[PDB]
Amino acid sequence: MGLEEKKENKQLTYTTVKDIGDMNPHVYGGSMSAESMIYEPLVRNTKDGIKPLLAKKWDVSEDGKTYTFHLRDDVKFHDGTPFDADAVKKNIDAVQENKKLHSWLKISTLIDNVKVKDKYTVELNLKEAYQPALAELAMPRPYVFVSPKDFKNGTTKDGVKKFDGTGPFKLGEHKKDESADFNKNDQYWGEKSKLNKVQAKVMPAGETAFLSMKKGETNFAFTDDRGTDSLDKDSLKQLKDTGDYQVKRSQPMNTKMLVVNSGKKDNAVSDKTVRQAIGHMVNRDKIAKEILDGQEKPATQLFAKNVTDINFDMPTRKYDLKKAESLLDEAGWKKGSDVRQKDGKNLEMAMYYDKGSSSQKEQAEYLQAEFKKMGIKLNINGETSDKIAERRTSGDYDLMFNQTWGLLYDPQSTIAAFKAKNGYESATSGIENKDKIYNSIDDAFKIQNGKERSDAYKNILKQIDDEGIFIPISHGSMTVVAPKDLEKVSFTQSQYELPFNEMQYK
Ligand SMILES: C[C@H](N[C@@H](CCN[C@H](Cc1c[nH]cn1)C(=O)O)C(=O)O)C(=O)O
Ligand SMILES: [Cl-]
Ligand SMILES: [Co+2]
Numbered sequence: 001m002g003l004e005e006k007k008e009n010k011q012l013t014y015t016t017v018k019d020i021g022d023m024n025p026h027v028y029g030g031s032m033s034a035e036s037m038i039y040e041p042l043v044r045n046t047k048d049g050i051k052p053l054l055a056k057k058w059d060v061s062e063d064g065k066t067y068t069f070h071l072r073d074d075v076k077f078h079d080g081t082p083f084d085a086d087a088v089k090k091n092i093d094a095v096q097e098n099k100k101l102h103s104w105l106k107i108s109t110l111i112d113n114v115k116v117k118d119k120y121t122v123e124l125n126l127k128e129a130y131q132p133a134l135a136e137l138a139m140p141r142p143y144v145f146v147s148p149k150d151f152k153n154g155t156t157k158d159g160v161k162k163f164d165g166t167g168p169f170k171l172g173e174h175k176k177d178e179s180a181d182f183n184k185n186d187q188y189w190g191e192k193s194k195l196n197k198v199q200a201k202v203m204p205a206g207e208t209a210f211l212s213m214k215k216g217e218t219n220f221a222f223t224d225d226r227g228t229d230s231l232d233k234d235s236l237k238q239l240k241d242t243g244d245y246q247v248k249r250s251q252p253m254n255t256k257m258l259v260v261n262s263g264k265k266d267n268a269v270s271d272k273t274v275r276q277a278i279g280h281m282v283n284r285d286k287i288a289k290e291i292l293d294g295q296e297k298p299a300t301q302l303f304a305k306n307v308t309d310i311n312f313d314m315p316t317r318k319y320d321l322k323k324a325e326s327l328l329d330e331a332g333w334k335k336g337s338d339v340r341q342k343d344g345k346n347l348e349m350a351m352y353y354d355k356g357s358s359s360q361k362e363q364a365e366y367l368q369a370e371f372k373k374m375g376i377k378l379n380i381n382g383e384t385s386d387k388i389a390e391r392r393t394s395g396d397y398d399l400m401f402n403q404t405w406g407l408l409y410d411p412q413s414t415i416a417a418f419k420a421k422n423g424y425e426s427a428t429s430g431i432e433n434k435d436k437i438y439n440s441i442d443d444a445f446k447i448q449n450g451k452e453r454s455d456a457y458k459n460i461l462k463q464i465d466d467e468g469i470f471i472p473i474s475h476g477s478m479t480v481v482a483p484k485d486l487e488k489v490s491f492t493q494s495q496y497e498l499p500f501n502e503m504q505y506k
Contacts, residue, residue, distance in 0.1 A: 002216020003244060003483065007506045012198040012482075014220035015209045015230050017356030018385055019202050020180045023163040023171060026095050026142045026156040028422060029386075032225040034200065036140050036497035037182050038078070039165035042069055042088070045138035045408060047493055053138075054083065054145065054166065064129025065112075071120040075189045077147035078164040078171075085122035089114040090148045091156075092124070098157035104413065104420040106445055107136040107143075132412070139408070140496060168193045168501035177202055182500070193501040205230040205356040213239055213481065221481040225496050226385035227256065227403045228357045229479055233293050239481060250478035250491040252306075254410070255299045256403040258282065258471040261395060262430030268333065268347060269398045270430050275468030277327035278399075279317040281374060282367070286319075288474045291362050296474035302404065302461060303411045304475060310411055311454045316465055316472060324374060333375070340375030348377045351399040352391060355382030360401045363473070395426035403476055406495040411457060415441055418464065427469050437463055 006013060021030040025039045042055040052058075054075060059068035075083035092114045095102065102108040110130055115123040126133065137143045146156060147164035163171045168188045172181030182198040201218050203209055209230040212218045223229045231239065239245040260275050261267075268274040288298040300315040317323075333340040333347050340347045351367070353360035364380040371378040378399075383391075391397040402424075405414045417423025419438045428434055437460060444456035464470065478495050486506040490499060 003219055004216075006216065006219050007483065007485070010194065010196045010506070012195060012220040012486075012500070012503070013201050013218045014198065014222065015203055015212055015218040016200055016221075016224055017202070017205050017209075017228055017230055017354075018224065018226075019177050020174065020200055021386075022159075024156060024160050025140070025144045025146065025165075026091075026098065026160075027101065028141055031200070032140055032496035033222070033498060034180070034182065035144070036167075036494075037169040037198070037500055038163065038167040038171055039140075039144035039146065040167050041138050041140070041144050042071075043134055043138050045135050045493070050134045050138065054088075064131075065126045067124040067126070067133065068117065069122045069124065071122060072189060073120050075166050076187055077145075077149070077166055078185060078187075079147050079149055079162065081147050081149050081164075083145065083166055084119055085116045087145060087148050088122045089116050090151065090154070091145045092143065094151065094154070094156040095142045097155060101157070101422070102142055104416045104423055105136050105139070105142075106130065106416070107133050135408075140494070169198065172197075188501075191501055194504045195500060198500050203230075205358060206232075210235040210238070213245070214242065216244075219245075219483050221479075222498060223476075223479050223495070224385070226354060226388070227254070227476055227495075228354050228385060229359070230356065231481060232358045233295060236479075236481065244484055245481050246484045246486075248480045248482070248489060248491075249295075250495070252297070252304070252475040252477050253406045253495045254404040254476045255302055255304065255472045256296070256401070256474050256476045257299070257302065258473060259392070259397075259400050259402045259424065259427050260469050260471065261398055261400075261427050262467060262469055263395050263426050263428075264398050265430070267349060267398045268331070268342075269349060271331055272467060273327055273331035274333070276317065276466075277324045277331070278371075278376075279468045279471050280320045280324040280327070281370060282471050282473065283319040283370070284473050287363060287366065291366055292359055292474060296476060299472035299475050302465070302470050302472050303414075307407075307410050308412075309450065309454050309457055311451075312458050314458070314461060314465065317468075321374070328374070335375055338373070338375050339377075346377060347375060348379060349398040351378055351380050351401075352383055352388055352397050353380065353401045354385045354388060356385065357401075363401070392424070392426060393422060395429065397426075407493040412445065415457065415460065416445070424469075428464070428467075431463075431467050431469075433463070 020034045023030045025035045055069040057070045110126045112125045150160040169182040172183040174180040180200045184193045284298040303310045332342040353364040368378040447453040488502045
């Protein structure tokens with residue numbers, strides 16, 4: 001039934017641990033790959049650089065503050081209404097009404113106004129010139145376009161009425177926490193999909209997602225926008241051994257790391273000395289080789305040198321238990337017993353991991369047992385990726401697993417996120433010199449000479465590394481399980497989308 005019924009209907013159903021969330025692409029809770037299926041930006045950012053999309057040609061003034069966009073005249077939203085310069089203006093205006101939500105993306109701080117020149121010409125006026133503007137208008141959020149007809153009283157910051165975009169699929173039926181359909185858009189202006197329907201199906205990871213893939217109740221799987229893979233290696237081995245599934249892994253795209261909350265004045269992780277101690281207690285070589293079964297390489301710094309503007313080797317603290325012990329002694333956390341104490345309190349920490357990531361869970365369990373030998377009670381907590389993200393915002397954590405944001409985002413956007421409420425500001429909020437460091441991040445984004453810019457990033461990361469906020473563990477990639485007879489599965493530069501409209505023969 002399952003796998004052939006879905007080939008006959010030209011259908012993917014993919015397994016995921018979480019629902020698609022709030023499909024308003026002007027905010028950030030909704031699934032990134034889902035939103036990349038229905039919404040589109042003016043321009044896209046390929047490996048060849050900027051390529052036209054909803055804007056076909058565009059002009060740039062000499063002073064660099066005015067961008068003129070000539071728009072396709074053959075684009076309609078999923079509700080019928082036309083995409084035109086007016087539509088572009090209302091969208092960008094609605095986003096800038098809520099620009100506090102977006103300050104991690106510098107372009108939102110410089111957008112002065114949007115002006116309609118005529119039916120299909122729209123003019124973007126900035127307050128300074130800024131060459132990443134094209135790059136940031138190509139991001140999947142927030143500068144993508146929703147049918148103005150769905151605006152709430154001309155606004156999007158407080159939600160939308162329907163979720164109508166210009167993409168190759170349209171949102172169909174969606175059962176909260178159960179499923180969401182992505183029906184082929186027959187009116188799509190560009191490369192029309194060959195699949196009739198991609199459906200998200202929500203279910204726990206582990207055996208229950210493996211079995212559903214084996215029956216063909218789902219036939220597809222990819223690591224989600226929080227880096228969670230619903231199928232571990234052995235499940236991939238068995239799914240390959242059916243002769244029914246293929247598996248593709250992308251180039252490395254990110255660094256997975258432990259995030260340490262310098263702001264949690266509650267806990268010893270607000271003490272720099274302790275942060276430097278535990279940064280010596282993470283045996284990344286053995287994690288990458290035994291815990292992750294060789295599927296990821298160890299990461300020694302936060303951004304690998306294949307990353308733009310990273311031109312330095314800056315290896316972080318190595319696994320060294322003797323250094324760890326002396327730093328904890330220096331901080332007042334002595335061994336009484338093997339447990340470590342200070343002012344009549346045992347050294348405890350609360351660590352958080354995605355309960356849907358089997359690899360985060362096993363890493364959390366390995367670290368718990370390692371930390372016990374040091375005298376630290378590591379209390380580990382398995383939660384949804386969405387609860388992890390909110391702790392990341394509220395700061396209510398001591399340690400958590402996370403990862404960098406990938407090839408389109410590292411290092412510049414991730415580093416900006418060091419000071420963003422919806423980024424990693426909670427974790428850096430306890431650094432004494434955070435004012436200087438935060439101002440360096442704003443300044444580094446102004447430097448045009450690459451080497452002196454690369455040095456600005458280097459000095460920033462050097463201090464962040466010395467503060468022990470981020471313990472890099474391994475380099476993650478994008479993994480896709482797909483029917484063996486499904487063609488044209490490839491990767492973009494983003495870990496947050498897949499060319500669903502290109503895949504074929506199933
Ligand atoms: C704005 C900020 N970051 C970006 C880029 C990074 N996304 C990853 C993954 C993710 C999934 N859902 C939301 N963010 C992250 O925030 O860790 C975004 O979500 O569009 C955010 O999530 O609010
Ligand atoms: Cl040190
Ligand atoms: Co995000």
